[PDB]
Design a binder for this molecule. Structure first.
Ligand code: JH9
Lengths: 169, 88, 104
């Protein structure tokens, strides 16, 4: 199944992030984010039977948790919080995070909440489980400068590596 | 205890041996003199690779919140080729 | 607590670390172990200012926030050549190429 293949790829990408904490409990996440700056976030397995993954993020009021729904091959933010048409869908969960991160970096949304009930997710910087490899830190920097990696002056082997993870976070 | 890493333009970088073993490539030569001469990595790249060694070793765990590792856009293409050559 | 450093002379760069409470003299003792020159044959600089052997690294201006693993602070090194101390001379690293247009 193309959908099975899209799910296995999303899980591969997640393992490349350096900020996927696997089977961390909701209280372990509360402890780890307690001292972090507002917007610091991580992804972890959900404790809930019906969900694969949950975002944990530091707000100014303390760490909070947002589940990620996966339904018929698309990821989106937990649909209990808003109408589904306002929760953009993604084939990839890292792409989902990247989107909302890029919304905040581009100052299209800020730490204040909207008054009209649309989605409020303030994400700044991920919490790494461990230091990423230097190759991957280089990859992130190149993605932050361009998406046109195939015109870069690099060997095909290193373009193939860039193509495996096109995200900016 | 320390090893010496030499760039293509002749800079000598002295780093803790435990730190250099971050590189899979250096790990092979050093486990298999105590100098390594990189004929194709220039000093502006090699110096940053050595900072990466310090940062990987300090932040191997999450006991401390892991800060970001800054990388100037201008070096990222060679740094990536260097990182791939060194396997780190 | 910890400060991370590059001790630099000509084309030599030492990556090492110390504590904010470490003294300049302890740093020269690290240099002696690696470069084999006693501390009384050494001078250490933060920028163009000589560091007094009896001061802590914190007292010289090296804090943990400005001397990070990923961005270590530079200490300049000058050896004693016979009677006279050499001038502080640190050779620049090579210059990075110009950024390709797609990345500009
Ligand atoms: C920027 C703002 C993010 C945001 C937040 C919400 C609402 N969010 C919740 O009300 C979640 C519900 C939940 C709780 C646990 C959980 O974890 P798991 O999936 O593993 O069961 C998953 C979800 N409540 C909590 O966080 C309360 C809590 C916190 C810490 C702790 F130690 C125990 C409980 C909606 C939209 C948003 F944009």
């Amino acid at each position: 199944s193309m959908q099975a293949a899209r799910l296995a790829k999303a899980l591969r990408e997640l393992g490349q992030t350096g900020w996927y904490w696997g089977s961390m409990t909701v209280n372990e996440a509360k402890e780890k984010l307690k001292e972090a700056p507002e917007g610091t976030f991580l992804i972890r397995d959900s404790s809930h039977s019906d969900y694969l993954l949950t975002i944990s993020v530091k707000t100014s009021a303390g760490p909070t948790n947002l589940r990620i729904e996966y339904q018929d091959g698309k990821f989106r933010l937990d649909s209990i919080i808003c109408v589904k048409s306002k929760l953009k869908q993604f084939d990839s969960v890292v792409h989902l995070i990247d989107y909302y991160v890029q919304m905040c970096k581009d100052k299209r949304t800020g730490p204040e909440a909207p008054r009209n009930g649309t989605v409020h997710l303030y994400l700044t910087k991920p919490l790494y489980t461990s230091a990423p490899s230097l190759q991957h830190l280089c990859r992130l920097t190149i993605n932050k400068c361009t998406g046109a990696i195939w015109g870069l002056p690099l060997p095909t082997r290193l373009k193939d590596y860039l193509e495996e993870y096109k995200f900016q976070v | 205890m320390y090893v010496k890493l030499i760039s293509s333009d002749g800079h000598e970088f002295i780093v803790k041996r435990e730190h250099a073993l971050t590189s899979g490539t250096i790990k092979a030569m050093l486990s298999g003199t105590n100098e390594v001469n990189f004929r194709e990595i220039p000093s502006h790249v090699l110096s940053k690779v050595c900072m990466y060694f310090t940062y990987k070793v300090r932040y191997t765990n999450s006991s401390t919140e892991i800060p970001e590792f800054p990388i100037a856009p201008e070096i990222a293409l060679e740094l990536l080729m260097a990182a791939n050559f060194l396997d780190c | 607590m910890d400060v991370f450093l590059m001790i630099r002379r000509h084309k030599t760069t030492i990556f090492t670390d110390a504590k904010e409470s470490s003294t300049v003299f302890e740093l020269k003792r690290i240099v002696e172990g690696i470069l084999k020159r006693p501390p009384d044959e050494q001078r250490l600089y933060k920028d163009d200012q000589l560091l007094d052997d009896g001061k802590t690294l914190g007292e010289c201006g090296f804090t943990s926030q400005t001397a990070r693993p990923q961005a270590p602070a530079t200490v300049g090194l000058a050896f004693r050549a016979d009677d006279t101390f050499e001038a502080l001379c640190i050779e620049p690293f090579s210059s990075p190429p110009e950024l390709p247009d797609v990345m500009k």
